Design a protein around this ligand. Structure first.
Ligand SMILES: Nc1ncnc2c1ncn2[C@@H]1O[C@H](COP(=O)(O)OP(=O)(O)O)[C@@H](O)[C@H]1O
Ligand SMILES: Nc1ncnc2c1ncn2[C@@H]1O[C@H](COP(=O)(O)OP(=O)(O)O)[C@@H](O)[C@H]1O
Ligand SMILES: [Mg+2]
Ligand SMILES: [Mg+2]
Lengths: 370, 105, 7, 370, 7
């Protein structure tokens, strides 16, 4: 059974090949205590990783090891992988090959560092590394299409063809879940709620996942929200306080389609998807339009499928047909696609064996698995 | 207008404002102030017959007499002062930076 | 404030 | 002439447009006698507002109507404004327009009640609300830079590239002069001095204003103070006792650059300036670096400008040059900038007329003012 | 105490 570990900026999913759901899904944070300890004999640890950090997040400084898709701290990344195998999964990687997932347009330094870290610290027998966006379409069951990969890192639009990522057609986008979370607390201060610390950032993320939604029409919804109190909903903080949000429900997710709210010159995810398609060839343009698949936790807002379809329809020519595919399992689309690829019989051919790694060195990752 | 053209010390801070693109890039404003300009390049006389400048406001009078009037050599004059200010300050630290890099190697 | 701080 | 009232968390400044200095500067405190009146010869008013309460602060419970730039008690705020117009300025608000100041990133209800009070209690012909940090830049004769304002409640960094501030790059911290005063009296107990009541709080503020200073090198200065002498200063209390403070002279201002002493996860006043600049465009970063402006009473410590320059230089790239501008009259920079704005002829069209407020109610303050 | 209170 080959492990399928999908590291991510927000959450990392781990499990086994052939399963339909990840075994362990915990936040990818590494918190350290900022206060000195007074009670002796408790055996308190120095660093808390995963669910332990979230439970005790009040007295910790939560730092995300991965920011904007690049690992800014390679010492904390080893801590999370160590916690994934021994603690959450309780399986020694000595007898199980490990599958890792990259990000589109990843620097070559990260590619070799991931191979070097695991082949020595964990010494797994075999490895294969694949693109997260590529695996997103594999879970949906189609090999050709354009993936609107979004998450807590950076939004990527990768129009893969025949299971291969087009390198020139990939368009980056920094609009992600973290930006909306930071933007939500900036506009929540207008009602008198002040969330500033990193511990309270997790609280805002819970609000975004439960109450926020995408409105079909922004101008129509704005007038309705001001006139009537129907749109207001109540949320309860961990301390017992009750808060009310009236029109922030459809104003924070709207920043995806209108980045000018955050002050970014780049266009929204509706126009980036259209721009990426235009970069591809004319003949294969027909197939990509009808096989667009959303992925990641950012695209889980209610009504985002309808808003995206309507707005991309106007930009696209009237001859083109739009079919936004939004599977309900799109949160774990990256992991599920990885499990499908690992379980394949022909997948044994492109393993990176431990014996082959020593003779070739860390540079084998560039040419073997691409 | 006499203090600004004198390159006095007290006018150093506000002369950077006149070098900004916002003040210079006024295609509509320049056209309207064209009849009130003085052809100081040759003759130093009013282009139009009367075009009394007293009717203009305080800020219109300053703009036409400085930007529109001296537009022939204003940009070159501003570039002459921008370079001088940079050399007076950035040159001292630049020498130190080059010495440190060479010494480290 | 309302939620957070004292103001 | 138009009255320019700059209500502040600690002190409020009121005057006339075109003047070079505020006419009246008194503390923004409202006190009520906790003890029972025993004599009948004097008036023995219910409450005292301004410097009247400061003189009799022994027998009163001083309460600040403004906390962190938000008016917590609107009943006391009406007392202060009634005292400003009728006792200090001795003018009728019914004839002169009033210009007010509000901190950025404030609750919408804070400036909505300000419009309602002005137009219904004092019947001012016109009104306007302006950002405190924006006016601080006008007093320095600049229209392109970053303003580091710091008072009693708010320490906000507002990068202003043009006449209008950049909204997406505004950073606000709830660490200011009042927070340092509470920290100064906490570490003063280490030497055996106990200041608890609000009347004793005003004594600590005097000590902070006269003896505290920012050390260029905190680690080196702590070792120097460990050798005793050459750093202890003597202060005389209103009772008559003489107190000596050693390392507390620079420890209290050091909480600004190291907020971890107060248990706040927020970054220091030096990092929050660098972070604010990083949110702007690449082309504009060159101008903002060389046009940094300090303002407010908190930044009046001896040596804060020198210390701030060193901290920013290490964080900023060595190519850029850092020039911190500290005008001698930066205490009244907020009011002086407002005086210039009010006296401008173009500003006459930005006033909110009485008829305009009636047709739209208090909600017009959000759409017109900024 | 020294300054403040009696202790
Ligand atoms: N139901 C939901 N509605 C809205 N946003 C969500 C929802 N679930 C998760 N998110 C956002 O998506 C992010 C999770 O990103 P994720 O897809 O795990 O990143 P990665 O692709 O790197 O694994 C979280 O930060 C959260 O803010
Ligand atoms: N000379 C000084 N040295 C140190 N701190 C000062 C000095 N003068 C004023 N302060 C601090 O500045 C604060 C008030 O500053 P100011 O901005 O003028 O008023 P406000 O903050 O109410 O707008 C006071 O709380 C005081 O602690
Ligand atoms: Mg992803
Ligand atoms: Mg102030």
């Amino acid at each position: 059974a080959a492990l399928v570990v999908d590291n991510g900026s927000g959450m990392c999913k781990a499990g086994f090949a052939g399963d339909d759901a990840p075994r362990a899904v915990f936040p990818s944070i590494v918190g350290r205590p900022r206060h000195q300890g007074v009670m002796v004999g408790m055996g308190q640890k120095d660093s808390y990783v995963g669910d332990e950090a979230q439970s005790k997040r009040g007295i910790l400084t939560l730092k995300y090891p991965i920011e904007h898709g690049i690992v800014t701290n390679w010492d904390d990344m080893e801590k999370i992988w160590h916690h994934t195998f021994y603690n959450e999964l309780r399986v020694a990687p000595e007898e199980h090959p490990v599958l890792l997932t990259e990000a589109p347009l990843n620097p070559k330094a990260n590619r070799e560092k991931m191979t070097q870290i695991m082949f020595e610290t964990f010494n797994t027998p075999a490895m294969y590394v694949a693109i997260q966006a590529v695996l997103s379409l594999y879970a949906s069951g189609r090999t050709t299409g354009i993936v609107m990969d979004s998450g807590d890192g950076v939004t990527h639009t990768v129009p893969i063809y025949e299971g291969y990522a087009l390198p020139h057609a990939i368009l980056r986008l920094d609009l992600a879940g973290r930006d909306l979370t930071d933007y939500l607390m900036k506009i929540l201060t207008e009602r008198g709620y002040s969330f500033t610390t990193t511990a309270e950032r997790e609280i805002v993320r819970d609000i975004k996942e439960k109450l926020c939604y995408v409105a079909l029409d922004f101008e129509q919804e704005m007038a309705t929200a001001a006139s009537s109190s129907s749109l207001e909903k109540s949320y309860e903080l961990p301390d017992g306080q009750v808060i009310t949000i009236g029109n922030e429900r459809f104003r924070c997710p709207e920043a995806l389609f209108q980045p000018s709210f955050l002050g970014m010159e780049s266009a929204g995810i509706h126009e980036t998807t259209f721009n990426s398609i235009m970069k591809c060839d004319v003949d294969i343009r027909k197939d990509l339009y009808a096989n667009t698949v959303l992925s990641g936790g950012t695209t889980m807002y209610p009504g985002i499928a309808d808003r995206m379809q309507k707005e991309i329809t106007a930009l696209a020519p009237s001859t083109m047909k739009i079919k936004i595919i939004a599977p309900p399992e799109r949160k774990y689309s990256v992991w599920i696609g990885g499990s499908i690829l690992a379980s394949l019989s022909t997948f044994q051919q492109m393993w990176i064996s431990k014996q082959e790694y020593d003779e070739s060195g860390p540079s084998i990752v560039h040419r073997k698995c691409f | 207008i006499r203090m600004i053209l004198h390159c006095d010390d007290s006018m150093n801070e506000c002369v950077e404002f006149l070098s900004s693109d916002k003040v210079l890039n006024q295609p509509k404003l320049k056209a309207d102030l064209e009849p009130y300009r003085i052809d100081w390049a040759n003759g130093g006389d009013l282009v139009n017959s009367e075009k009394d400048a007293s009717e203009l406001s305080r800020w219109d009078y300053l703009y036409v007499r400085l930007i529109v009037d001296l537009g022939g050599y204003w940009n070159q004059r501003m570039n002459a002062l921008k370079v001088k200010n940079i050399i007076e300050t950035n040159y001292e630290n630049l020498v130190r930076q080059t010495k440190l890099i060479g010494r480290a190697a | 404030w309302x939620a957070x701080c004292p103001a």
